[PDB]
Design a protein around this ligand. Structure first.
Ligand SMILES: *[C@H](C)[C@H]1/C(=C/c2[nH]c(/C=C3N=C(/C=C4\NC(=O)C(CC)=C4C)C(C)=C\3CCC(=O)O)c(CCC(=O)O)c2C)NC(=O)C1C
Ligand SMILES: *[C@H](C)[C@H]1/C(=C/c2[nH]c(/C=C3N=C(/C=C4\NC(=O)C(CC)=C4C)C(C)=C\3CCC(=O)O)c(CCC(=O)O)c2C)NC(=O)C1C
Ligand SMILES: *[C@H](C)[C@H]1/C(=C/c2[nH]c(/C=C3N=C(/C=C4\NC(=O)C(CC)=C4C)C(C)=C\3CCC(=O)O)c(CCC(=O)O)c2C)NC(=O)[C@@H]1C
Ligand SMILES: *[C@H](C)[C@H]1/C(=C/c2[nH]c(/C=C3N=C(/C=C4\NC(=O)C(CC)=C4C)C(C)=C\3CCC(=O)O)c(CCC(=O)O)c2C)NC(=O)[C@@H]1C
Ligand SMILES: *[C@H](C)[C@H]1/C(=C/c2[nH]c(/C=C3N=C(/C=C4\NC(=O)C(CC)=C4C)C(C)=C\3CCC(=O)O)c(CCC(=O)O)c2C)NC(=O)[C@@H]1C
Ligand SMILES: *[C@H](C)[C@H]1/C(=C/c2[nH]c(/C=C3N=C(/C=C4\NC(=O)C(CC)=C4C)C(C)=C\3CCC(=O)O)c(CCC(=O)O)c2C)NC(=O)[C@@H]1C
Ligand SMILES: O[B-](O)(O)O
Ligand SMILES: O[B-](O)(O)O
Lengths: 160, 161, 67, 161, 161, 160, 160
């Protein structure tokens, strides 16, 4: 959140917030409507966005669900969708927040060591997120899709 | 530290839930108090020195504390005391701006009671001073902003005793 | 090697520091044996007061095997 | 830290004696197992990541620990946890190699329990994970080396209790 | 730290008083003994190693302390011990010159008993060795200066016990 | 005090005091009765020194005792004189010690922050201190005035 | 020993031991029985090695056993030999450990400070250790004497 970021900076310089920082906060709190709207829509369609995104991912990345793949099997595949759901949720937190800090703190820091250990091909996880963006892109207004897209692109870029 | 927004996000994340109706209600309440908080902050920053000055005049000056033998005697100690008052004000303002007291625990109350007890800084007198700033700040920002700032002034106080 | 677990309080005797120094004022930290004499004295000269000293690694009177 | 050798030497020195019979038996005893220790360390090093992976899968995954609310939830905590397991394995190997637990007290256990308690890291779940590592490790190095590594895994476990 | 001059100034200040008769006498007493304190310090500095050598010989040498198993065994620990003695002698001389023990509380006793106890350094033997230094110093500086120095040697000993 | 300074310097180098430091300490102590006498003259004439110093200050700085001024009112004017007395007391301490350490530790460190908060014009406090010097110079021999003078000058320079 | 050194180095780099370190430990343990044997013969002839090195030292440095000398007198002389025996014992420890670390930690660190305080001429203690090397030569094969000698030389070199 921009409020926290501003407080952290001001505190680092042992001063109150600068008029510029306080103004950006004013703007932030008022221009929230469109972002909460976007988050709500993604939340409501979660089951569908993830389900269809999985389908796309497996079509483009069949290796992950074939003998030897990390998500091979009914249960393993279910776990894969569970992770996509985790990220979709994280994406909604980031959208309402106005930045990718919640996404970064809950699901990006250490993500490579986690998946590296599990044997999960992280680039494929990136693909599933891109897929969710795609599916989401058929539910959001071209503008809402454009704004939320920045968040999806972040997670995807970070998942490599 | 965390603000009111992040605080809600984290309460939902620990449950593994997407933000629901109530969570979303809390978020709106914060966003809607945003300009009032910024205003109060802008005012408080301007009156920073005056708030402390008056709080000190009201609770510490002309007593035993400032005379020889007092913990506020010697220019070095007087200055350190008002500096702390400055910190408390600034930090409480931060907390109010954020609508969350986590910054107070992380940056103010963290090892403070120990330092004061160790150096011999009278905890009670400090609490009186912080509370004097509460009365002073309230009369400047209005009852609403004053109530908010107050929860934070009291938060610091409670952590001292 | 051998390690000391120490706690001290170091005040400000020269200037009214305005930046958050509470973190640098009251502290607890591990100090390797070979650094304790120099560190202890550093705090002592700064008007700081030492509250607690422990041998964190436990073994006292090691003749050989200090690494 | 001491190894089996310097440990015997230090004790003979404290008595001011040239190595006596008991001391010589101990040194010889270490020397006769030396290659077995190296052999075991070689295997562990080569299967380091695999040991942790199976241990985690056996004792930590698909439980409340990894789900929202558990200490292994969030990619940061997951990574931190397995990083610990990596530390334990690497240190237990050092100790097994040395034939002495001193490196464990000096470089690992020292105030570890306190750090965990303050961070909320479940010591019980951690001991479980280490115990799982013991089994996985033994399946690669054989019963004798598994038992000797078990000694150091058990030592780390007792230090957390 | 403070010397005899500043100690008086500080006691007057805490009372908010100008120097009264009692305080002026305390100051005149210090001024009249200054040259004598300087003379003793000159002598002590010129015989510092000698003082420590005889003291160690009289109190520590040829005992369990220096034999295998003793805390003064190993050249490493023998050096640490005589280094401490060198430190005690130097600080006691400073305290003597200052005519005030504060420097001992601040720079010697400050966390010493704890370091010693955690390390297992024998405090009874250390006290005996400082006691011996007191005797050796007195035989070089004369009766009066020997008694003044004794005040500071004893101060250190009391802080260790 | 030169004794404390020499010790601090000596300890910083883990050495005994040098012949020079020891010699300086000898001069310091022998010079003791002289410094105590000067300090006594000031202590004895403290009321007149402070009272007449105030008179000079308020004449040159009528603004401080006029409405809106920091020392306006008899109580406030009394507190102003009390501060001058504090500084005079600190000055006698300095004289006895042979240096300004007593003065700075007790009344110089943080003095600007203290007066800025109180709303007291520090430059006027400096002027008041300089006035006390002027008055004291009417009872100290040229030599004694020269000696005590450096302490008043230190305080005035530090307050200004 | 080499086991500790390798571990200390590996820990410094947060890594497992290198193949070379492990190979060095293999040589260390296999050559264990030989080092034990060499140290054992020195141990078995300790009394003679110390005594003879003594006579040799005193014939060479009579000043130490003459009036005013550090080892002057029967008791002092016995203490001097006591020290040679201390070093012989330390040397046997080093031989078994494979390195001089036991000797360094027990009898080298602080050695110059100890003897200086005692008034013992360090160079003579060194010469006494070299005298022990010579006596050990008359009872060790050329291979053993060369292996053991490196320790004796280390000690004599450090006691300069
Ligand atoms: C894993 C079995 C589980 C777990 C662990 C966990 N640990 C931590 C954090 C820390 N771990 C250590 C431990 C070490 N540091 C060392 O240098 C060594 C060896 C010498 C060890 C053993 C430390 C110091 C920390 C502290 C912070 C850090 O990251 O360094 C965490 C993160 C805690 C947090 O919220 O920040 C976790 C999650 N958690 C589990 O649920 C289990 C079962
Ligand atoms: C012999 C080659 C010469 C000699 C020796 C000498 N040494 C001493 C006294 C002491 N020596 C030690 C030595 C050590 N302490 C340790 O911990 C170790 C390491 C293992 C060593 C080598 C100590 C502690 C003493 C002090 C007596 C004691 O045992 O407590 C003396 C006597 C000195 C005296 O005046 O008392 C002597 C004579 N003297 C020589 O001239 C040489 C060359
Ligand atoms: C799906 C795109 C692909 C895939 C996924 C997959 N993941 C796992 C297992 C786990 N994933 C996690 C993930 C998280 N934990 C967190 O705290 C966060 C942040 C919010 C995330 C994203 C965890 C902890 C696990 C371990 C299982 C558990 O829940 O405890 C699997 C199963 C792996 C296995 O072998 O068990 C799979 C299959 N697999 C693919 O190939 C993908 C491209
Ligand atoms: C003022 C109302 C009263 C008072 C205060 C007083 N405080 C100190 C010294 C310190 N105060 C702090 C506090 C903080 N530093 C921080 O970084 C934070 C958090 C952001 C806080 C709250 C600290 C660390 C110190 C010690 C180090 C320093 O002074 O810089 C003093 C002086 C103590 C001394 O004897 O030197 C005083 C006098 N004293 C009163 O009587 C009050 C009622
Ligand atoms: C000597 C009479 C005896 C004795 C002493 C001994 N001391 C140590 C170790 C330390 N001594 C100190 C001492 C001080 N720290 C200070 O700030 C001051 C004042 C200026 C003193 C005197 C410290 C800090 C240590 C530990 C760290 C270090 O050595 O640098 C030892 C060594 C302990 C060990 O196990 O290695 C010894 C042997 N021992 C005796 O038996 C005495 C009678
Ligand atoms: C006189 C030259 C002028 C002046 C003085 C003035 N001072 C105050 C109030 C205070 N002054 C102090 C001073 C000190 N505290 C210390 O520890 C030391 C060091 C020894 C000093 C010099 C303090 C603590 C106060 C606060 C009151 C108290 O004693 O508790 C006032 C009163 C201001 C008010 O608003 O109440 C005044 C008037 N004012 C001038 O205009 C002068 C040029
Ligand atoms: O300290 B001088 O420099 O030796 O006088
Ligand atoms: O230690 B080597 O260098 O790897 O042999």
């Amino acid at each position: 959140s921009i409020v926290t970021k501003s407080i952290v900076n001001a505190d680092a310089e042992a001063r109150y917030l600068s008029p510029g920082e306080l103004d950006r906060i004013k703007s932030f709190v008022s221009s929230g409507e469109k972002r909460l709207r976007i988050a709500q829509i993604l939340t409501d369609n979660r089951e569908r966005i993830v389900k269809q995104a999985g389908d796309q991912l497996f079509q483009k990345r069949p290796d992950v669900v074939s003998p030897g793949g990390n998500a091979y099997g009914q249960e393993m595949t279910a776990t894969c969708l569970r992770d996509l759901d985790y990220y979709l949720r994280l994406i909604t937190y980031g959208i309402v927040a106005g930045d990718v800090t919640p996404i970064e703190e809950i699901g990006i820091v250490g993500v490579r060591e986690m998946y590296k250990s599990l044997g999960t091909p992280i680039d494929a996880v990136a693909a599933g997120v891109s897929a969710m963006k795609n599916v989401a892109s058929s539910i959001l207004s071209a503008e809402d899709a454009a704004e939320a897209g920045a968040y999806f692109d972040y997670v995807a870029g970070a998942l490599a | 530290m965390q603000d009111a927004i992040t605080a809600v996000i984290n309460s939902s994340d620990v449950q593994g839930k997407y933000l629901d109706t109530a969570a979303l209600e809390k978020l709106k309440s914060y966003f809607s108090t945003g300009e009032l908080r910024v205003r109060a902050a802008t005012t408080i920053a301007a009156n920073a020195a005056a708030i402390v000055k008056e709080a000190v005049a009201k609770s510490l000056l002309y007593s035993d504390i400032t005379r020889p033998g007092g913990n506020m005697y010697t220019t070095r100690r007087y200055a350190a005391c008002i500096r702390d008052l400055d910190y408390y004000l600034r930090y409480a303002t931060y907390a109010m701006l954020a609508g969350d007291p986590s910054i107070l625990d992380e940056r103010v109350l963290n090892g403070l009671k120990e330092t004061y007890n160790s150096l011999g800084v009278p905890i009670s007198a400090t609490v009186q001073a912080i509370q004097a700033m509460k009365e002073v700040t309230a009369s400047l920002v209005g009852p609403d902003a004053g109530k908010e700032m107050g929860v934070y002034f009291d938060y610091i106080c409670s952590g001292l005793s | 090697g051998r390690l000391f677990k120490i706690t001290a309080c170091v005040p400000s005797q020269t200037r009214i520091r305005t930046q958050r120094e509470l973190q640098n004022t009251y502290f607890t930290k591990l100090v390797p044996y070979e650094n304790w004499f120099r560190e202890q004295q550093r705090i002592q000269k700064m008007g700081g007061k030492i509250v607690k000293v422990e041998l964190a690694t436990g073994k006292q009177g090691i003749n050989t095997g200090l690494a």
